[PDB]
Amino acid sequence: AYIRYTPSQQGVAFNSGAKQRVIRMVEMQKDPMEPPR
Amino acid sequence: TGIFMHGKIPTLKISLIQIFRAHLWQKIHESIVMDLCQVFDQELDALEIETVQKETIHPRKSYKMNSSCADILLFASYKWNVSRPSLLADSKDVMDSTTTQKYWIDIQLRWGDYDSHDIERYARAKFLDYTTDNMSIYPSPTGVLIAIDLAYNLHSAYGNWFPGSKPLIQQAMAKIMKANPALYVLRERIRKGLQLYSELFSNQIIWFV
Amino acid sequence: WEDADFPILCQTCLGENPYIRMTKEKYGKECKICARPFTVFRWCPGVRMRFKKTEVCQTCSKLKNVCQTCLLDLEYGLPIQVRDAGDMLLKLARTTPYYKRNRPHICSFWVKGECKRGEECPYRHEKPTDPDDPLADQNIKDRYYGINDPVADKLLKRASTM
Amino acid sequence: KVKRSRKAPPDGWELIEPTLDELDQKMREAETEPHEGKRKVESLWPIFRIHHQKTRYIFDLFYKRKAISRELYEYCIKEGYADKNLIAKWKKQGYENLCCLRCIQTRDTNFGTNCICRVPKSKLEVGRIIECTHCGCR
Amino acid sequence: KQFKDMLLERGVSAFSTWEKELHKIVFDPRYLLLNPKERKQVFDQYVKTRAEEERREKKNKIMQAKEDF
Amino acid sequence: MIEVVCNDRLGKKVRVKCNTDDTIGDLKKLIAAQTGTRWNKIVLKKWYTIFKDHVSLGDYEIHDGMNLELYYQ
Amino acid sequence: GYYCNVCDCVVKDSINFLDHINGKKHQRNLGMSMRVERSTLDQVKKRFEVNKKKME
Amino acid sequence: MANRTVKDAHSIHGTNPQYLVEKIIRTRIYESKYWKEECFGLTAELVVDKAMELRFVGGVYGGNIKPTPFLCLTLKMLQIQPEKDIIVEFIKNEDFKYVRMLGALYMRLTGTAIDCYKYLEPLYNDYRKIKSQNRNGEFELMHVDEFIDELLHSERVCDIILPRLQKRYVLEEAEQ
Amino acid sequence: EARKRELKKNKKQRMMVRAAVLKMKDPKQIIRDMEK
Amino acid sequence: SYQKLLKYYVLNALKHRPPKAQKKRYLFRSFKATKFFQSTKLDWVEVGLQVCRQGYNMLNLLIHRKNLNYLHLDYNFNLKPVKTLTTKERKKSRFGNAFHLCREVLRLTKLVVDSHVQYRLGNVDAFQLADGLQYIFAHVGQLTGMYRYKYKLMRQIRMCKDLKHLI
Amino acid sequence: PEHVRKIIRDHGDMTNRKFRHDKRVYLGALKYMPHAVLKLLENMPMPWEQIRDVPVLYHITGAISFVNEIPWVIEPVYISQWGSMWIMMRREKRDRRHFKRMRFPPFDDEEPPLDYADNILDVEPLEAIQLELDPEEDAPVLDWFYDHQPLRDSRKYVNGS
Amino acid sequence: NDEEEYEAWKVRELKRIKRDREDREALEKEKAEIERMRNLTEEERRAELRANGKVITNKAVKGKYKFLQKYYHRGAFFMDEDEEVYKRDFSAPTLEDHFNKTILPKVMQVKNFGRSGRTKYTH
RNA sequence: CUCCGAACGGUAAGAGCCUAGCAUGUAGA
């Protein structure tokens, strides 16, 4: 006014060794010159 | 026709649009143009005239006030000596000017106010403006900007004068501001809205079928 | 109006790399098919991939059983039209999902003729596939709904020829 | 880029005068160049390069070649000819030669604040393709 | 040389224009001895030279009379 | 001596004190000297009634308080 | 007043009609006339030929 | 359509490709009689034909801002954005006068100050007459020197505002 | 004071009624159908 | 004038309570920490012309987005019309609230910057420069269009009037 | 250093030079936090030392160049400077008869004043109103009286940078 | 009249060439005039020499506002031109200052329902 | 005896014809 996620969907041979697929999650910088989009 | 005003003033706005029911200033422009045409057709050869050449003006040429077209285009006879641009009330006219062969007349109506009494001033102003204005259809350089103030019943004119017509146009405007039909209709509509109740001629051998 | 924690993603949309790097953005980009603010996060599916993002929002995709950025499926891998009209899907699907989706689309400067970036084009230097087949012409909203797919009829007639 | 310093130049400025003005002419030419052809930021690639070479000269005169005096290794930085923080970044043993920020990891700046040639030459330019977004230094 | 000579014999002015002096020379046989490009070159050289010798001959007369005095 | 109001609905409401028998050229000169502008760009209208720079002021029948729509050329 | 047979429309003011055929989407549909600048030699032929036609 | 030049134009650094003239004056240039004709397209060649047939050199005339065909043609060539070679060809033409006048005016509006002196300086020798339209409509015959002098030294020699050329002393001290 | 607002509302209602009357019997609605 | 100055001084003397609060809130210090800000060293006249051009381009793009092709800001921050539109356009240009005041402020700023640009570009360059700044603050009293958006400005302009006769 | 001069080379275009993608923040954050008219209204270049430097923080898309530099003039030196200036101004007003300082509105309708003066700037008359002090009584304030920051490289009289 | 055109082409070339050199030396002449005024201010005469005119572009020949005639501001935008339209002595009643504003009962500043201000310079 | 103000309360509504500066950058085969 990191994350570890087991892909329980498809893991057989996608991504050879589709073991648990860890990732990195950052946030993107918001410039303070942008009106309401 | 109720050309303009200042402020909103809805009451006077309805009063003025009621005072002009139909296309009334178009009617007045037509009536006065034909009056001038008849005054010219009375004494045509006496003024070295060629023919009444009332030019096709726009249908709203009387309501538009930005431009100024020629109401009538008098063709003079030959080598017609024009006088200097002056007023209608002045008698000391200067006949030392050019000699044109076309002579334009443009009748203008000015619904004046208290700060617009002087029709001679507005007349000469519009004359000089239309003359210097390089934007208007304007055949002849010498002519007259005879103006009429319908809000005070005034008449004026300022322009290049004919030799031996200044009193002619004077008498014609005196006889047109009085006893004019559309002018009488204006006066009657105004008396009615204001609530202050106080071919005919032959000599032409004409027929109708 | 719609925040979350982790995206409901595919297995091919994530990429052929066990460790990728996401970038959450609280309230970005306005969901494609319902017009609602949601949480856009992109990543790189692999080396020389397309830097894939997130289109279709959490409730948009969760309700209709579909992934947040390709609108195919989390369970099978078929479109949302074949998996509705049509079981047959299990022999129709595929394992080892081709990474021909995660690749850069065609450099238009090359199609015109002067791709100035040379060998350094981060886009892709192939010939623009001819326009004529309706697999040049699908969109998002007609895809996401069952109505009018260019793909789903062409794969649904693969289901009765042979 | 010399305008004034309200004093005479130091003792041996006459020797650095032509070489400095050559780079200054290059800078003035690249600063008034057309945008046509620069894709999004290509117009900003060579300017940093012009900022590189300039310092790469004066530093060699500063205390590498030991040819500039004590004045002509601080006065040039006091006025606008080089970059003090940039040279101090070159003083370290890790960052020998690299542009400002085009390839480095997440620094104080969310995009990068460390370097542009900071890609590791073992696996830099992943696979074969080398490029940078600020300086374009492979 | 003949064209240069006719320019003088026909009294072509060094303080006027080609188009404006042409009526002086066109009837003259020597006019036929050059093409347009050659006519322009000889003319331009005659004008430049006659104007320069005239201005210089006047500036000299005054300077010589001053110096003698 | 007359007080005229060169006005507009765009944050330009100027009041120029000009002579009685003066022209419109000097009036434009005053209006340009006062607000922000040069002399040859100003245009004083009143509902498409363009005032020209050769007729006089009292001849067009302007008086104390008359407001005129300013427009730049 | 003015009449456009391509669009079969009646153009009133002379200026209103002047601003149709120059910009008409239907008339533009009869061919894209985006004028590209000719070569530097092309602008020389028009200057030369007119010097020999108008004057000469 | 009078928005873009053709499809892409090297934007003059001053204001914009088409906006080197004031917004009011260009907006007036569009709606005009002379614009209604010849707006169908004029890329490189017909411009020469339209230029040699207009023996006026002026800007605005009349109370209502009326652009001369000189001014409207300057704007038309400005929208066309010809290459520098064509402009040097117009600047080198001595037979047709007002064509050279337009070439000089355009090279002044769009061009480098170094190039301005390099191409406009040798136009400071012609002692011939040139007709121009005053603001009141009345014409006047002046000298070409007056034009190029007001163009190179004075500001707004016509209705257009000039893009602030340096004083010549700075360039004489720094360059040729 | 409020009489001006009342008269303005009455005039707006009358203008809306006149517009609806001219549109219901419009040349593009009535006379266009009369010619069909 | 002296009476008005003493009045402002005393009325400031009363409304002087010890300020101690806000926990040291700072601006343009976190902006430099993000990737949406970069520090450099550029001459003051350059920064002034840069700010003036930036403000003009910001207002011009506001007017562009707002679908008003019949208005022009004129580069002296004086909003000028084009064709005298009066059908429904004049009702779509009655800003009067903030556009007016931002226009006045940027006009004052660009005017000071132009007065200083003429110096470096060959103005009088003598005490004339300070005389220019003096009469510029005088005109900000009168010539600027500050009065409309806020009338309390006249108070300080009265100070700027009274302060004049102090010097 | 010169990143700003090239970042200004796009004042508005048709998606040609950072027009569309950088449009909204070149408008939004531009209008939201103007805040630089204040800084320019707080960083006068001090005509007695008119060589002002003004370090500036700018937006990468070229929205605004904010001047983070706050001025820190020294009180008695400040007052003595403006007093010597007062004397010089009285002198120039008393000596000069004809006074050309009516230089009002510059540019006038769409001459952007930025052309080869926010640049290399071959002209630099930084000798405006500097009083010629005799080194017989103004000796100790002879070299640090017309430098805009007469403390920087002192380390004895200036507390710090 | 080609002989006359080339004669005037030098008449204009001489003036235009004279303006260039006259502009260069003016910077030294202005500095030299300050140097001449410097020695003139130094040891010319102690209140015994002016050599001046006190020249001003536009002389504001003011008068005396009657009782509450408005403070008319001429507008300081164009004064270097020295146009004669400015020299008119703006000390006249514009619209309502024609009255005496003393026979009135107590006072009348503005009867427009907006009298925010309160001042007359009595103190 | 020099203190000088701006916006709204304002421009009837209308059917036939016509012209245009601006905006997306993607999913997928």
From Swiss-Prot, chain A:
Record-listed cross-link Glycyl lysine isopeptide (Lys-Gly) (interchain with G-Cter in SUMO2), residues: 19
Subcellular location: Nucleus
Modified residues (Phosphoserine): 8, 16
Function recorded in the entry: Involved in pre-mRNA splicing as component of the spliceosome. As a component of the minor spliceosome, involved in the splicing of U12-type introns in pre-mRNAs. Required for the specific splicing of CDKN1A pre-mRNA; the function probably involves the recruitment of U2AF2 to the mRNA. May recruit PPIL1 to the spliceosome. May be involved in cyclin-D1/CCND1 mRNA stability through the SNARP complex which associates with both the 3'end of the CCND1 gene and its mRNA. Involved in transcriptional regulation.
Name of the protein in its database record: SNW domain-containing protein 1
Subunit structure: Identified in the spliceosome C complex. Associates with U4/U6-U5 tri-small nuclear ribonucleoproteins (U4/U6-U5 tri-snRNPs). Component of the minor spliceosome, which splices U12-type introns. Interacts with SKI, SMAD2,SMAD3, RBPJ, RB1, PABPN1, MAGEA1, SIRT1, FOXN3, U2AF2, DAXX and ATP1B4. Interacts with PPIL1. Interacts with VDR and RXRA; preferentially associates with VDR:RXRA heterodimers. Interacts with NCOR2. Interacts with MAML1. Interacts with NOTCH1 NICD; the interaction involves multimerized NOTCH1 NICD.
Homology family: Belongs to the SNW family.
From Swiss-Prot, chain B:
Localization annotation: Nucleus; Nucleus speckle
Segments of this protein annotated with the region Restriction endonuclease homology domain: 24-195
Organs and tissues of expression: Widely expressed.
Disulfide bonds: none
Highest taxon listed in the record's lineage: Eukaryota
Function of the protein: Plays a role in pre-mRNA splicing as core component of precatalytic, catalytic and postcatalytic spliceosomal complexes, both of the predominant U2-type spliceosome and the minor U12-type spliceosome. Functions as a scaffold that mediates the ordered assembly of spliceosomal proteins and snRNAs. Required for the assembly of the U4/U6-U5 tri-snRNP complex, a building block of the spliceosome. Functions as a scaffold that positions spliceosomal U2, U5 and U6 snRNAs at splice sites on pre-mRNA substrates, so that splicing can occur. Interacts with both the 5' and the 3' splice site.
Assembly, per entry: Part of the U5 snRNP complex. Component of the U4/U6-U5 tri-snRNP complex composed of the U4, U6 and U5 snRNAs and at least PRPF3, PRPF4, PRPF6, PRPF8, PRPF31, SNRNP200, TXNL4A, SNRNP40, DDX23, CD2BP2, PPIH, SNU13, EFTUD2, SART1 and USP39. Component of the U5.U4atac/U6atac snRNP complexes in U12-dependent spliceosomes. Within the minor spliceosome, which acts on U12-type introns, interacts with PPIL2 and RBM48. Core component of U2-type precatalytic, catalytic and postcatalytic spliceosomal complexes. Found in a mRNA splicing-dependent exon junction complex (EJC) with SRRM1.
Curated annotation (Swiss-Prot), chain C:
Disulfide bonds: none
Cross-link (Glycyl lysine isopeptide (Lys-Gly) (interchain with G-Cter in SUMO2)): 91
Zinc finger boundaries on the chain: C3H1-type: 101-128
Domain of life: Eukaryota
Annotated signal sequence range: none
Subcellular location: Nucleus; Cytoplasm
Residues with N6-acetyllysine modification: 154
Record text on subunit structure and interactions: Component of the pre-catalytic and catalytic spliceosome complexes. Component of the postcatalytic spliceosome P complex. Interacts with PDCD6; the interaction induces translocation of PDCD6 in the cytoplasm. Interacts with PPIL1.
Domain free text: The C-terminal RRM domain and the zinc finger motif are necessary for RNA-binding.
Function comment: Required for pre-mRNA splicing as component of the activated spliceosome. Involved in the first step of pre-mRNA splicing. Binds directly to the internal stem-loop (ISL) domain of the U6 snRNA and to the pre-mRNA intron near the 5' splice site during the activation and catalytic phases of the spliceosome cycle. Involved in both translocations of the nuclear SLU7 to the cytoplasm and the cytosolic calcium-binding protein PDCD6 to the nucleus upon cellular stress responses.
Family listed: Belongs to the SLT11 family.
Protein name: Pre-mRNA-splicing factor RBM22
Organism: Homo sapiens
From Swiss-Prot, chain I:
Localization per Swiss-Prot or TrEMBL: Nucleus; Cytoplasm
Top-level taxon of origin: Eukaryota
Signal sequence, renumbered to the chain: none
Biased segments, Basic residues type: 5-14
Tissue-level expression: Ubiquitous. Highly expressed in the heart, pancreas, kidney skeletal muscle, placenta and brain (at protein level). Weakly expressed in liver and lung.
Illness association: Vertebral, cardiac, tracheoesophageal, renal, and limb defects: An autosomal dominant disorder with incomplete penetrance and variable expressivity, characterized by cardiac, vertebral, tracheo-esophageal, renal and limb defects. Some patients also exhibit craniofacial abnormalities.
Function noted in UniProt: Activates pre-mRNA splicing. May inhibit PP1 phosphatase activity.
Subunit structure: Interacts with PPP1CA, PPP1CB and PPP1CC. Interacts via the PGR motif with PQBP1 in the nucleus. Interacts with the WW domains of WBP4.
Designated name of the protein: WW domain-binding protein 11
Taxonomic lineage from the root: Eukaryota, Metazoa, Chordata, Craniata, Vertebrata
Covered residues, full protein: 24 to 59 of 641
